Design a binder for these strands. Sequence first.
DNA 1: CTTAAATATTAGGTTTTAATAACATCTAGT
DNA 2: ACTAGATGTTATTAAAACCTAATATTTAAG
Lengths: 393, 386
Amino acid sequence: MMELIRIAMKKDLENDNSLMNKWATVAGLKNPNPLYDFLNHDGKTFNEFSSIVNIVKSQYPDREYELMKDYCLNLDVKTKAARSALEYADANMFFEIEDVLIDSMISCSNMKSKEYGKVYKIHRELSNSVITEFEAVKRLGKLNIKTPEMNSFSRLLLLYHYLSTGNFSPMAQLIKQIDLSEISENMYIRNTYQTRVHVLMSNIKLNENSLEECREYSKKALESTNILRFQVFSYLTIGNSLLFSNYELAQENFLKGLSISVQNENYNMIFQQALCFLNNVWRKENKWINFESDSIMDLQEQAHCFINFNENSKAKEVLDKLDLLVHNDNELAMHYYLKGRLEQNKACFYSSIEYFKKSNDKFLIRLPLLELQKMGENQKLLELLLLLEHHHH
Amino acid sequence: MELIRIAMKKDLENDNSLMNKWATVAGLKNPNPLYDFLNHDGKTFNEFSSIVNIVKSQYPDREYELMKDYCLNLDVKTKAARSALEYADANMFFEIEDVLIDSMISCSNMKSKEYGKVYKIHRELSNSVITEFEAVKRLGKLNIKTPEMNSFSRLLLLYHYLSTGNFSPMAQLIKQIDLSEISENMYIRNTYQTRVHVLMSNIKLNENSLEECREYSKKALESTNILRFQVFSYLTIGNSLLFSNYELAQENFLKGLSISVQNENYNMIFQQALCFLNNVWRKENKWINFESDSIMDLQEQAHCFINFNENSKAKEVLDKLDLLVHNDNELAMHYYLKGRLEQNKACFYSSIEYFKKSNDKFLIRLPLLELQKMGENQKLLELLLL
DNA sequence: CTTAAATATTAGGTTTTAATAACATCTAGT
DNA sequence: ACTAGATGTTATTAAAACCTAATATTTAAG
């Protein structure tokens, strides 16, 4: 079988012979002779996976998934190339590629490939709550990990668990034991894990309330990667670190995330909601509100446009719609915050804080608090509910 | 020839009635095994409680002396040694436990090897020699076979989850424990059952489920004759009451004091708990310690003086405390005392600050109560308790 | 004090699993 | 294409976990 990327490159090369020298620079090669091999010989892989990733990202950016899915799924799993494809798929959250590779690699006869798949299955199972952190780290001990790559990914997938649930305390200690410099086989994996650490470092500094460091680590992330997923969330993170303090710089960062995600439905919508919510927080005319949606979040942000602009009747219509819907803890907290501003009623604001606490939200909880501050309450106490790290001597 | 055997021989010569009584204490149908125990070096009982309950009944004031001699002489390749292990940890007899560990880790018995190795992980983990990631990784590589150690691997994590104060994944991890899967070693089963009650009480403590917390502490007290679990069950029940019911609180602290009379450390804990309880409730305080210059005892002098309007005498104490190294939890108290003494709300805000900096959802009531006295929004400082 | 039945413990012999390295393949670049 | 260098496979050995047999020890009735 010939892979789509090889068919593509053959056709493009026929219509443009200058491509071979240019692909060879994109691929890190000293001259393009491996690139003949690659096109003509089934099974030919390059020593590092970034050679085919950067060629795909440069010649066919709009088709990366289609070609990489076809490429990875015909890789012999016993090879370094395919180990590389596992991290590739996980990093971009291509779970249909990731999980097919994993099950092939777990029963394959190559000890490295088996080890890679096996800890990667653990990370999927843990992050889908099919097993427990306790069960998962046990299986990690039981595998008797040999490769530096999985040594480092075993601590990474835990940090990805701590982050999801919420337990931020031991992360700064756990991540500091990661030592990527011990990796010597797979520079693709090393360089992505380096991006991964930057992102994790960024989020840790976010919750330690060290926002300028948060922004530096996300900057380091962006400079370290060409992977949309990581780029997307570094801009998200940066903007959130600025959402309540610097309107124009947060909007600048959200728009940059919006621009690079025009073609990705999930990622474009994330920045749409963020811009909408940003502009509501700052009481601005809001081009981002979605009047054709009956989700809770979209509906909530309408009530916010309205309450912001003294359209009190029209905000009542939306909250009446909301009253009929399945609210969870964090969504009710927003409800109460909205109901509070509409009825100017401190008691809602209190319930708002209450359900933000219950849903362990140290971020949107600024909304009820600011409102109470504008109504004569004791700012010193309001600060203590938003329990921010203070950095004393 | 072990001391406890010697003591038993002598007391038997002077009271021949003891053989039948020891046998019921030990759960034997008849005391013929007790003869063997006295006549033959190396005789052990099917169940470790037999000798523990005897020792507790006839020699309650020499339990450490006699059990240390008895354990440290067992054959570590044996179920009496395994039992002796848990016994050692459960009473916090670390000099017994640790010696037992080094010898079972390299002994030829597969089962003792396994026990010794998961208790090494537990000591190392709780002494901060390894991390919990490293610890759990090793429990995986042991490929634990015995139900006993399957249960204790979850337990030693739950204690670390306590010491640090991760507190949250506790309630799902402890539910995974299934003590009924233990068939070999009933002593270990029953003390692990006490352990779970104790842990369940502390879980329900940090969910402010105080009536359930007192229930689990109760079930612990009924399930055990180990002074450790009894001391901390009574302390736990008092603290659960310390801000709502002065009398029932004191009654539990007093009860804890009476069983701890011969133990220096357990006695101090209860003197300090009574001292702080009465300072909380602004009573005359017969439990102050005027010779101790520890931060905690000095703090409570300041607290008593402030209670009784001797502000000048409490400033003398606070000046002495001003030049001693405070951690976050200690500093919180200091800001509490300074705020009461000075009638200064900013000191209370700071105290709430340093109370949340050590994740103390207990003693933080002190500043919150003072600000409610001073006119602040009760709905607001209700929220500070979450 | 014996001792038989039940329970624990130790060992002999087996299968699995894992570490070593000798051999073979594949890659990059002349 | 073909060579050095870097990776993959396989043959050979150690080993370590794993049962089933035998041996010891415990309880409680003689």
